[PDB]
Design a protein around this ligand. Sequence first.
Ligand SMILES: *CC(=O)N1CCN(Cc2cccc(Cl)c2)[C@@H](CC(C)C)C1
Ligand SMILES: *CC(=O)N1CCN(Cc2cccc(Cl)c2)[C@@H](CC(C)C)C1
Lengths: 304, 304
Amino acid sequence: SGFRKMAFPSGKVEGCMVQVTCGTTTLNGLWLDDVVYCPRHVICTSEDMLNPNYEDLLIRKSNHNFLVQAGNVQLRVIGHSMQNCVLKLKVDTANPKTPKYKFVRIQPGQTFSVLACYNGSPSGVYQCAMRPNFTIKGSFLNGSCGSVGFNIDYDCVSFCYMHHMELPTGVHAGTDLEGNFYGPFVDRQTAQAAGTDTTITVNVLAWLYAAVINGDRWFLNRFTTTLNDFNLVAMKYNYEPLTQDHVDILGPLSAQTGIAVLDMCASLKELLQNGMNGRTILGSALLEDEFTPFDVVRQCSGVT
Amino acid sequence: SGFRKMAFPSGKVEGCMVQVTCGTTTLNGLWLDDVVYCPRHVICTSEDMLNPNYEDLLIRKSNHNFLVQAGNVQLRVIGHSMQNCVLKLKVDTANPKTPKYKFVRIQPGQTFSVLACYNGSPSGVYQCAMRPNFTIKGSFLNGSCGSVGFNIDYDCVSFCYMHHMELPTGVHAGTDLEGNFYGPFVDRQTAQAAGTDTTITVNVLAWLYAAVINGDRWFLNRFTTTLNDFNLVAMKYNYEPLTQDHVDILGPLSAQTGIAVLDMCASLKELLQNGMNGRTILGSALLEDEFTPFDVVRQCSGVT
Ligand SMILES: *CC(=O)N1CCN(Cc2cccc(Cl)c2)[C@@H](CC(C)C)C1
Ligand SMILES: *CC(=O)N1CCN(Cc2cccc(Cl)c2)[C@@H](CC(C)C)C1
């Protein structure tokens, strides 16, 4: 037992990290097969970032201008291209450590692990959720750009995120591995509105089931509710509306604990209306939303 | 910016995990050089766990009874020995993936990453603190025994913990890599008292400095205190007494933020006496104690 914000083992991703330098800018790249993926802003200078003309900036660059180092070995760049906000540098050597992988575009509310990297070297790993407003609340300093988010299904790494920037509010924005930003963000040093965020209701419910599985049951009550009544409370407290698809995904957890999803919704309703009353749930004094129902099942069963 | 409960990249440890089977019991082992380290309770049966006579149980075992598999390859066991609560199985092959490593016995209040493993395969990674009462609040199911805790200094992995058991209270107990339990715990299915735990004061203070560095400053006040006055509040709220060694270790963070350690102690004093008043600090509604001053500096600087 016990419930922790667990990240995937980062080994398969560590083996893909490289350092990419262009002129005087250095960030992280992801070396998979014979391609190195990195944020296209690696081609900018400090004066370029207000509104870079990336097509023009990339034209002044040749394959030899992109310095790619994997640890101590230098990769030979034989091709370069921009796809959306990422640069794809073709190298003459396939990464011997390339795991089985996929590029996926995650949905808001889904989770993933981030391997924070600086100068091509891994510093740490943490579990993130893609917020409903398409930002992530990460830990990223200067040089962390090009660090990636991923999930691992047995031996397959599904890369879902690449870090590009920090908004003036301290939240993080980035792209999928095809270079498309999540949310309305653009890769320029401009003030950008992150949309109104909401709490991931299905995840808070999944976490309440994890709490019941692990012994924390104080919040369980003698009440039930309906999807419509619960959604009136969710709207008031800036929670995502709960749908039947969300109820269906909570099926396994409802089955294991024997607590109907709507009864758990009534517990959540009372927690939203009354607060925690100085108590904790799974060591937290607030309602956690960065564990999906899948994460809860995986952690509570022992999937490797 | 941003502050997260970050674990070390687990790659160097993943490469050491093996599955150890003895009779019908299977748990995880750590393969370093030509030695596989695992909890000695791998030699027990269900009827043995009330009070195992490990010396007698190990005598009925031969090298061929210890089945060690690293992924799909079978290791050949050429020696076996018990050192405290760990078994050391000498194998005929040095692990090609053995990183630079040390065995260290961590101090209470210090942190480390745990690579939870099942059947020799890594499931996830999380950051833990060794509680002042020598337990850890982990996430460990049946089969997780033999999973290890570690820190990484550049290329050197300092292994500090091996998981052995879950106390009836849901907290976790284990040993250093020489097989000595942290705390008064013994490897038997007996009800065992975990000592009175306390909050790691120096870590909560280190985390308050991380909050100030990252923008959360609401808790800063116009007050100061003394070590003696603060310690009267710490005693009341079951916080570890703050010493000059702790003040000294907070030196760098005090220097960076320009907030004297005793002024931060007065902020902590007011937070202890008044609570959070429905507010949060670094996304938490309680006082976090599982980040050391070293962890804060590392995360806030970008050490890889
Ligand atoms: C991710 C990272 O380390 N950095 C944040 C982005 N910086 C450039 C930038 C500025 C404004 C908007 C965007 Cl999309 C990108 C990085 C600059 C260094 C020199 C790599 C730092
Ligand atoms: C760590 C783990 O997976 N397990 C917890 C300990 N179990 C045996 C046990 C019982 C009582 C006290 C101690 Cl020190 C150890 C493990 C049993 C399986 C069969 C490995 C499970």
